[PDB]
Amino acid sequence: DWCNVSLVDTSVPEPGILEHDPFFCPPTEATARDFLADALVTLLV
Amino acid sequence: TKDGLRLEGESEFLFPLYAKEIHSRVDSSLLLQSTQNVTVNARNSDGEVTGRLKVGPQMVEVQSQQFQINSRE
Ligand SMILES: *[C@@H]1O[C@H](CO)[C@@H](O)[C@H](O)[C@H]1NC(C)=O
């Protein structure tokens, strides 16, 4: 059938990260103190 | 009290909170609600939030690299 003869040639058909930033959540930094020496002073006076 | 401190009132913290273990009472069920959404967040060592369990206004979202389900074992 010559009517459905198809010819095709070459053509030019030419058509991940994860991150979220919150603002802050710092813990108790510099965790050290004492309430004896000052108590000793104010109970030694 | 001797071993703790009991509070019966609305302790509005006008600044952030910090703790290690948040419990609920034995005889009452913890509830946590809002009007827009409630967010659980977890961060990497650089502080980058990487796993979110968000309960939005309509339907829940989970955002992560993986989503397992197991049994107790
Ligand atoms: C190609 O074949 C189809 C199916 O038989 C037919 O409908 C169509 O008319 C044919 N095309 C031509 C140009 O004859």
Curated annotation (Swiss-Prot), chain A:
Protein name stated in the entry: Alpha-sarcoglycan
Complexes and interactors: Cross-link to form 2 major subcomplexes: one consisting of SGCB, SGCD and SGCG and the other consisting of SGCB and SGCD. The association between SGCB and SGCG is particularly strong while SGCA is loosely associated with the other sarcoglycans. Interacts with the syntrophin SNTA1.
Species whose genome carries this gene: Oryctolagus cuniculus
Role: Component of the sarcoglycan complex, a subcomplex of the dystrophin-glycoprotein complex which forms a link between the F-actin cytoskeleton and the extracellular matrix.
Gene: SGCA
Positions of glycan attachment: N4
Family of the protein in this entry: Belongs to the sarcoglycan alpha/epsilon family.
Region of the whole protein represented: 243 to 296 of 387
Subcellular location: Cell membrane, Sarcolemma; Cytoplasm, Cytoskeleton
